[PDB]
Amino acid sequence: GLEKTVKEKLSFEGVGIHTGEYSKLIIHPEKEGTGIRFFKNGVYIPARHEFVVHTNHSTDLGFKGQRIKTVEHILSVLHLLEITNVTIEVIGNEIPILDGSGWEFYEAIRKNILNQNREIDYFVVEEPIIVEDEGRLIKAEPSDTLEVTYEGEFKNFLGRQKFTFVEGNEEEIVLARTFAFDWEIEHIKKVGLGKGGSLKNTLVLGKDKVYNPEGLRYENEPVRHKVFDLIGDLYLLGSPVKGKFYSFRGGHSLNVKLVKELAKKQKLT
Ligand SMILES: C[C@@](O)(C(F)F)[C@H](NC(=O)c1ccc(C#Cc2ccc(CN3CCOCC3)cc2)cc1)C(=O)NO
Ligand SMILES: [Cl-]
Ligand SMILES: [Zn+2]
Known part of the structure; x- marks a missing residue:
């Protein structure tokens, strides 16, 4: 398939399952070759195994003193939709859990996909x-x-x-x-x-x-x-x-x- 991003910025918000804190996300379009990455307090954290910092009851990523808890559910949705280039800006410490499933992410992102110009590797x-x-x-x-x-x-x-x-x-x-x-x-x-x-x-x-x-x-x-x-x-x-x-x-x-x-x-x- 083609590499894909989102057509427009998408926001989500709510409490995180492990921190119990309220957080906000903004999903940003990105050009071919960017990959999936998080962004927090000015730091980019690629969604790659090199940045895993915790795996007990959730998968958490970190870089340069900025951490994001519980990335597995948003990443699963992006994997299933083959969204390949996107920045997930996180204001807070954890991805919102929403209703406990991927459904709200999946439905919103699915209607907001932009095909790009090279094939997925x-x-x-x-x-x-x-x-x-x-x-x-x-x-x-x-x-x-x-x-x-x-x-x-x-x-x-x-x-x-x-x-x-x-x-x-x-x-x-x-x-x-x-x-x-x-x-x-x-x-x-x-x-x-x-x-x-x-x-x-x-x-x-x-x-x-x-x-x-x-x-x-x-x-x-x-x-x-x-x-x-x-x-x-x-x-x-x-x-x-x-x-x-x-x-x-x-x-x-x-x-x-x-x-x-x-x-x-x-x-x-
Ligand atoms: C499922 C996993 O373990 C997986 F790792 F296997 C993991 N989930 C998790 O690791 C995980 C861990 C804990 C919780 C919780 C909770 C909770 C829910 C309700 C109440 C309220 N009381 C219930 C009883 O009556 C009185 C009121 C208390 C606490 C959710 C989730 C996953 O999905 N990671 O992605
Ligand atoms: Cl192999
Ligand atoms: Zn889970």
Whole structure:
């Protein structure tokens, strides 16, 4: 496909899931070859794995003393829409969580795409690779299309669930919300996270029950959201990705580990 930016500036705002603070975004058009980058307090922070500074419960980026928390959801939306050149100006410390899914970003950006004049240079997985960490694993292999499978094993009524995204089915994952388990809430707050989480932006589950009165959007909403997360972390390769991925219980740390191994393989090709 063609490289793409946005036609006009787009703004979003609201509380961040981990800081609990209100922040504002402005998405700016950029010319061919710019890449995806954040901008904060006069500093550009490229959306690339070299700038990852935190991977526990979110993926955070930083450069020259300026940090942005929770980039995975906006990056996933930009990856799915193959937006390749854009500056995300952040006034605040975190990307807004909005309703917990990518939907509001996706719908607004999708109607505001500007095609540009050169083709995308995709990051094309060239050979199989496996990374592992204490029973979690992620595999990748070549594919002409982006295909991403997540398999989870939940310690509550959800049990084992599996979901596969393929190109063309973007609407199946951009509405899946972030989620949390009630028995983990106290620890997440103690380690300084989750300050913005509420039933308005998080699917909260117990051992046997659903806290949200509206219930789940899909019976497998959590693994759909985990696929959505992984697609955002994969965009830290710096280009839209072609390959077939399978994650068993992976999280941001393992996602970024895979990204860094893939980037090392193609550093000069
Ligand atoms: C899903 C992830 O873990 C992923 F990493 F796997 C991760 N999400 C996260 O890491 C993550 C972590 C925590 C929260 C939260 C919360 C919260 C929600 C409501 C209340 C309110 N109470 C609920 C009970 O009744 C009384 C009221 C408290 C706290 C959300 C999200 C991801 O999406 N990263 O991109
Ligand atoms: Cl490769
Ligand atoms: Zn997420």
